[PDB]
Design a protein around this ligand. Structure first.
Ligand SMILES: Nc1ncnc2c1ncn2[C@@H]1O[C@H](COP(=O)(O)OP(=O)(O)OP(=O)(O)O)[C@@H](O)[C@H]1O
Ligand SMILES: Nc1ncnc2c1ncn2[C@@H]1O[C@H](COP(=O)(O)OP(=O)(O)OP(=O)(O)O)[C@@H](O)[C@H]1O
Ligand SMILES: Nc1ncnc2c1ncn2[C@@H]1O[C@H](COP(=O)(O)OP(=O)(O)O)[C@@H](O)[C@H]1O
Ligand SMILES: [Mg+2]
Ligand SMILES: [Mg+2]
Ligand SMILES: [Mg+2]
Lengths: 179, 499, 478, 290, 108
């Protein structure tokens, strides 16, 4: 994808990569996402009517308490100057996808009816680094009851590639008995 | 938008706590469709030339808040994305000097005739202002085209904009070319701009100028059809600024634009690629201002400036004679007159195919000399008679001698008007031809005899009685001494041409 | 201590100027860019605020050439709209769009200046007096008589005679006018403005000595000018006209050639302002831009402007929106024809498509009105017969339809007239034709007492007596 | 926000209050004889209009049950109309022609004929020259037609929002008298100019355009305007509103977009042609098309 | 020597994304490394028509785009469509690509 939100996030990652603050910058970017969730905080930055000069002063105070990285504080200042603060949320989310690309890591999603153990997670991570080529592999879990018993993982560059065996047995048997 | 490319952005993050001026150089964001967007150049002026790594020049015109739109003069087919640009400091100029005579030249005033570099000391602006309301005077000198049908009946003065308008292959380039060939004796510098034409067609014209010595006072500004749309949009402004170097240096100048029609379609090509909202026939709104920046630069200047002139002869092609079309109707509202070359006459062998009744000139009698005002006044009233007499000629079919004389007179008045291509006639020869044909000294000849008689008649007067040329070149008036001395040679030529 | 802007963008003649947040210029206020060139420092780039953009930024339109402007020049807000010198100091002078003298004379007395954006006169302050106005022209005085104190349009394409006919209405009228005439040149030949400036001086109107007794002010923004300049030329000439109406309380003539070029320039910069165009690529604000000029022209109970405008008609198309939006403002429209100018009938006025509010019997009289009807009933019937005589010819027409063809073929040539201004084209002298001569000249063709004369006797003669004297020589000479 | 005035003094960043109401008009009996704005404020300079109630400028039309059949004549004095193309009370009859063909003079002679007919007349003049509107008011007031006539005038110097609302200012005045058991006649002098003012508003609001860059809802512009003209039933007091729209055409081109719309809305059309007009037939009713 | 990736396939029109420095100029031939219906390699030749900015060109295919996937590798040839010329072309029917479509062997 190449949209304005994606374009900005990619720049932010590239500067971190140059300066070797990829771990350090990523923590700050995660820290920002908590900040901009709040409807009141996001609204103040986003709306055109509030004066830009006031926005910087408030932003500086926010940066100090936060203790953000020197570029990360710039990056928000750049967004504010160039009017694209209305799409901060898209930009922040976009950065995570870019950050995985730079490391060479991959992300996976595995879902189950009941919570499961760590060795299963490590072996799914093994299989996903096999079929994907993660330099390293990463994993996430979301407990959903409306399946039968299985696990579904979800991976790829987007949340695209899906394999599972819980209810796909049953829906598959409906669609195979119509044959 | 264009600036948010992630390299430009990435650079910005690194330098945020910093003062900077990137005013000197810039980075190409994209090249496409005749324009380039360039990040940087924070102190270019609007209309400034910018230089690329490949050598392509562009005029900085769209100075937006983060980028600059640069109109590429040439193909941008080599301009690599990310390459560096250079602010020249100069603002849309061509070098111009006396060394352009004899040279075939580009729209960027670069030589394309393979004859080496051209030395120049001064410059002139491509978008330079027209003369004002007080910097002008009335058009009073004649500019002689050598075509009898213009110089007697639609006469072009020095400083006049006169339109050469007709369909394709009706002799439009010929009327422009024969006008340039006639400026040999006069101190008139011709400039020929060929916009979007066949390179074979321009090479024939340049060779015809070399063959006839017209390329010692002529610049040829040549774009072809293979050339990009910006250079065809540019080249009339180049050729006008070559013609303004001599105008404001007290010289007289003659500029020809071949297809103002093809400049209008190259600027239409540019602005539809620029995604600009068009109007009638998809031409944009700046189409009138396109050709009126150009043709208001043609002016007879006042004596407070040295009395330079610039006769502009633009050429507009019509589609099946559609004078109501948008591009012919814009130029007719700018131009002082028009010379309609019609295709019914060209197909009938009536070359030059000048439709006399529809062709007008704003300075009619002010342009012509006193020999032409006296003699060609009877020519304009006979064709007013003969236009009505060709009507109901076959209806009546019983032609009496109050009509059958005045028709067979009127057929040989057309035989006066036929000239061969690339052979103009001098003013003494025009006033000698129109005098004999109006009086009826040709009436006993056949229609295949008038063309051969007058060639023997002008060659008689050059050789044997040159006092007729002495009167018209000095007095510039058809004198009773000149009229009698001509009638003596009409008698001798009738004695020779019979036996 | 005026607020100071910086240029943010330069797109053609349209500049976006960044202002401080506390102070913004109002719409239609003039901005002065500092400007710079090779030799000197010209502050001669005047702008005019069109749109407030947001982020403390306006959008302005330049009145000069923007070549040589850099992003980041200082811009001075004048705090008022574009002011123009008005009064007796403007008499005998040629002006820019900006109210600046072009004629290479002394500077104008700018004690009395006036803005070019004013509201129209109120509904209460109008006058309703319907006086007729005589021009000396046979098509104009008979079939579309002009409104003394009202808007008048000359319609036609390129090369049909709008400029020659408007120079006849200066020649016949403006010297006989008891007040000041104002010419506004909007998008025309600079040669044509040079000739008018000489025609005024040769006619004694602009006298070289004692120039303050001249009774003509000329305002020129011509073809060479940038499109922001050519929008505001008609408003500069109109502001100077409505000074003499309001303050000096004089009758004013306002010739504007061409008001189509006022529209066409407002269409070009509207593309640069980023607006969504209307039909045929025209600006969406067309009827409001056009009506802002024409509703300031109307006559008040103090003075009276009479405006004669040339309206260019693109591609001979009267259905084009810029000719069509003009028709609603005019008291008399004189549509010129190309098919009549191709014949050589001049002035090439279409006698049926040319209209007037004035041709009503309570205004023109009952003798004038019943003959203007009978000319138009004759030329309408001959208009309908030109599909029958186009193919079969005259030979198949009935006895009555041939008589209507015969009289209407004589009416069309007696509608033509030699002009004083056209004596350098043809050489024949012009003829002023009074309305008492015009009504009796068409009484004779419609009563049929001149049916024996040839049709070419009626071509390009002033009176009907000259049509009689020309009829002798065509019948005498053998 | 589309402005009901020129926005010259309006400052970027300034405050703006919401009034709470949608588009009302002061309304009374005192509008008879007054030349008013699109805001119903008197522009003839004769004093303030005493008005107690209010109506909505965009009020809904009467329904199918609120009406009855058009059965009463509205005489125009033109024998070509009252014999072959008759207009009744409650009818919308379009008057369509070219420029300078007799559109206003048909419609003015209708109002002048209502001298003792006991109807209220409203003359709406959208986008029309102010010396032309002042001449219509002078012709009305000389005959004593101004004793029963309202004139609503928006000249072309006005902004496009007020020209757009001038027929709705006039029709809300007519519905004041239609609902108080009176019979009303309304003339809109130039509906075509209402649509061009509405084309300007919608193209500066950046709405996507359609044919001749008119918006898609330029049909619903005139339909909710003209369907207000109706004859009410005997339960609603049996008052009427006769609309007479005026639409100009371009040398008789009814293939054009706005005349094609309004012909389909009204209850009939009166074609005035310029060929019948120049050839002496006045009023130039082109009957076989009407 | 440049590898691009298909960014989008809209009809016969492709957008190909390149690395930031190495970049085709306009009219150069792009060879899209595609796969066929059955599963064999078959390549699609294109031509750069627009440089869209952000290291991305817009190409118009010389063959069918039916079965092209966003993200396949594209070879920048560095030159426009080169076509065999000589006396080896006489008597032969050619494609746009200079490929013989008359089933008489390759052009030697
Ligand atoms: N006066 C003349 N006498 C004889 N031949 C002529 C004359 N004028 C033109 N021709 C011939 O007529 C042909 C058409 O003329 P020319 O090419 O000058 O007109 P054009 O309208 O510019 O053509 P195009 O529109 O194709 O460029 C030429 O081949 C020329 O040789
Ligand atoms: N029955 C009639 N008899 C004589 N003249 C008439 C008649 N009807 C109209 N006219 C004349 O027609 C002329 C134009 O009329 P009017 O202005 O009403 O038409 P219009 O279509 O409204 O014109 P515009 O389009 O300019 O508004 C008027 O001057 C009037 O004198
Ligand atoms: N009354 C006239 N008599 C003779 N020729 C005329 C007359 N009026 C106009 N013309 C011819 O028409 C030509 C162009 O007319 P012009 O006034 O320039 O038209 P426009 O105003 O439409 O540009 C003039 O140069 C002249 O030759
Ligand atoms: Mg040619
Ligand atoms: Mg003109
Ligand atoms: Mg009317």
């Amino acid at each position: 994808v190449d949209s304005t939100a994606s374009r900005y996030a990619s720049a932010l990652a590239d500067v971190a990569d140059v300066t070797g603050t990829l771990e350090a910058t990523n923590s700050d970017v995660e820290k920002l996402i908590r900040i901009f969730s709040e409807e009141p905080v996001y609204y103040f930055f986003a709306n055109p009517v509030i004066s830009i000069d006031n926005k910087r002063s408030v932003l500086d105070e926010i940066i100090t308490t936060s203790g953000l990285q020197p570029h990360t504080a710039n990056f928000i200042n750049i967004l504010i100057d160039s009017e694209r603060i209305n799409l901060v949320k898209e930009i922040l989310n976009e950065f995570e996808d870019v950050f995985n690309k730079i490391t060479g890591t991959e992300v996976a999603v595995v879902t189950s009816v009941v919570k499961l153990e760590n060795d299963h997670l490590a072996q799914i991570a093994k299989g996903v680094q096999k079929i994907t080529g993660a330099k390293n592999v990463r994993i996430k879990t979301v407990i959903d009851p409306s399946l039968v018993a299985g696990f579904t993982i979800r991976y790829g560059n987007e949340g695209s590639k899906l394999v599972d065996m819980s209810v796909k047995k049953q829906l598959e048997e409906i669609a195979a008995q119509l044959e | 938008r264009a600036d948010e490319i992630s390299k430009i952005i990435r650079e910005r993050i690194e330098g945020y706590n910093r003062e900077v001026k990137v005013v000197n150089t810039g980075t190409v964001l994209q090249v496409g469709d005749g324009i380039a967007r360039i990040h940087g150049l924070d102190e270019v002026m609007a209309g400034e030339l910018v230089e690329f790594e490949e050598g392509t020049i562009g005029i900085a015109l769209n100075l937006e808040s983060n980028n600059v739109g640069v109109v590429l003069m040439g193909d941008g087919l080599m301009i690599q994305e990310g390459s560096s640009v250079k602010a020249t400091g100069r603002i849309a100029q061509i070098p111009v000097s006396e060394a352009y005579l004899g040279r075939v030249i580009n729209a960027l005033a670069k030589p394309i005739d393979g004859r080496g570099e051209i030395t120049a000391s001064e410059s002139r602006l491509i978008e330079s202002p027209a003369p004002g309301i007080m910097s002008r005077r009335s058009v009073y000198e004649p500019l002689q085209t050598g075509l009898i049908a213009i110089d007697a009946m639609i006469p072009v003065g020095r400083g006049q904009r006169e339109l050469i308008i007709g369909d394709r292959q009706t002799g439009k380039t010929a009327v422009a070319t024969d006008t340039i060939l006639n400026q040999q004796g006069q101190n008139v510098i011709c400039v020929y701009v060929a916009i979007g034409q066949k390179a074979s067609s321009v090479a024939q014209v340049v060779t015809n100028f070399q063959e006839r010595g017209a390329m010692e006072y002529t610049i040829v500004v040549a774009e072809t059809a293979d050339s990009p749309a910006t250079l065809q949009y540019l080249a009339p402004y180049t050729g006008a600024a070559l013609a303004e170097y001599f105008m404001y240096r007290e010289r007289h100048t003659l500029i020809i634009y071949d297809d103002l029609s093809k400049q209008a379609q190259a600027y239409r090509q540019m602005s539809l690629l620029l995604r600009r909202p068009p109007g009638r026939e998809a031409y944009p709104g700046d189409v009138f201002y396109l050709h009126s920046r150009l043709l208001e630069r043609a002016a007879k200047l006042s004596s407070l400036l040295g009395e330079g002139s610039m006769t502009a002869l633009p050429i507009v092609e019509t589609q099946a004679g559609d004078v109501s079309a948008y591009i012919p109707t814009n130029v007719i509202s700018i131009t002082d007159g028009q010379i309609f070359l019609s295709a019914d006459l060209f197909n009938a062998g009536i070359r030059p195919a000048i439709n006399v009744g529809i062709s007008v000139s704003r300075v009619g009698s002010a342009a012509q000399i006193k020999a032409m005002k006296k003699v060609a006044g009877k020519l304009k009233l006979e064709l007013a008679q003969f236009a009505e007499l060709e009507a109901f000629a076959q209806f009546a079919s019983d032609l009496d001698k109050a009509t059958q004389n005045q028709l067979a007179r009127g057929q040989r008045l057309r035989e006066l008007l036929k000239q061969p291509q690339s052979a103009p006639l001098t003013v003494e020869e025009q006033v000698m031809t129109i005098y004999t044909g109006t009086n009826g000294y040709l009436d006993s000849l056949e229609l295949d005899q008038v063309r051969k008689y007058l060639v023997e008649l002008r060659t008689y007067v050059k050789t044997n009685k040159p006092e007729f040329q002495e009167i018209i070149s000095s007095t510039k008036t058809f004198t009773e001494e000149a009229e009698a001395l001509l009638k003596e040679a009409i008698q001798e030529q009738m004695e020779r041409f019979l036996l | 201590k005026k607020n100071l802007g910086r240029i943010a963008q330069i797109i053609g003649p349209v500049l976006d100027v960044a202002f401080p947040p506390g102070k913004m210029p109002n719409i239609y206020n003039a901005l002065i860019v500092k400007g710079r060139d090779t030799a000197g420092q010209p502050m001669n780039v005047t702008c005019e605020v069109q749109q407030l953009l947001g982020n403390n930024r306006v959008r302005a339109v330049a009145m000069s050439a923007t070549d040589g402007l850099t992003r980041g020049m200082e811009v001075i807000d004048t705090g008022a709209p574009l002011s123009v010198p008005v009064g007796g100091a403007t008499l005998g002078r040629i002006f820019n769009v900006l109210g600046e003298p072009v004629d290479n004379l002394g500077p104008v007395d700018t004690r009395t200046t006036s803005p070019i954006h004013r509201s129209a006169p109120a509904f209460t302050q109008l006058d309703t007096k319907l006086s007729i106005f005589e021009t000396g022209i046979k098509v104009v005085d008979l079939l579309a008589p002009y409104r003394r104190g009202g808007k008048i349009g000359l319609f036609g394409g390129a090369g049909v005679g709008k400029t020659v006919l408007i120079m006849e209405l200066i020649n016949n009228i403006a010297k006989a006018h008891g007040g000041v005439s104002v010419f506004g040149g909007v998008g025309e030949r600079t040669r044509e403005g040079n000739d008018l400036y000489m025609e005024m001086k040769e006619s004694g109107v602009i006298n070289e000595q004692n120039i303050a007794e001249s009774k003509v002010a000329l305002v020129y923004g011509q073809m060479n000018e940038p499109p922001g300049a050519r929008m505001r030329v008609g408003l500069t000439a109109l502001t100077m006209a409505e000074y003499f109406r309001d303050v000096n309380e004089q009758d004013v003539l306002l010739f504007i050639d061409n008001i189509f070029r006022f529209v066409q320039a407002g269409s070009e910069v509207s593309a640069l302002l980023g607006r969504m165009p209307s039909a045929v690529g025209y600006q969406p604000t067309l009827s409001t831009e056009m009506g802002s000029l024409q509703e300031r022209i109307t006559s008040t109970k103090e003075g009276s402007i009479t405006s004669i405008q040339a309206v260019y008609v693109p591609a001979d198309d009267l259905t084009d929106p810029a000719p069509a939006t003009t028709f609603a403002h005019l008291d008399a429209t004189t549509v010129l024809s190309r098919g009549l100018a191709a014949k050589g009938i001049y002035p090439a006025v279409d006698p049926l498509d040319s209209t007037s509010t004035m041709l009503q019997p309570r205004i023109v009289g009952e003798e004038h009105y019943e003959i203007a009807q009978r000319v138009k009933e004759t030329l309408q019937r001959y208009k309908e017969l030109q599909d029958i005589i186009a193919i079969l010819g005259l030979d198949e027409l009935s006895e009555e339809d041939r008589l209507t063809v015969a009289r209407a073929r004589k009416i069309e040539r007696f509608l033509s007239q030699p002009f004083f201004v056209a004596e350098v084209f043809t050489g024949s002298p012009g003829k002023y034709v009074g309305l008492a001569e015009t009504i009796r000249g068409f009484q004779l063709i419609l009563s049929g007492e001149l049916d024996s004369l040839p049709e070419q006797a009626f071509y390009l003669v002033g009176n009907i007596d000259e049509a009689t004297a020309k009829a002798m020589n065509l019948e005498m000479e053998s």
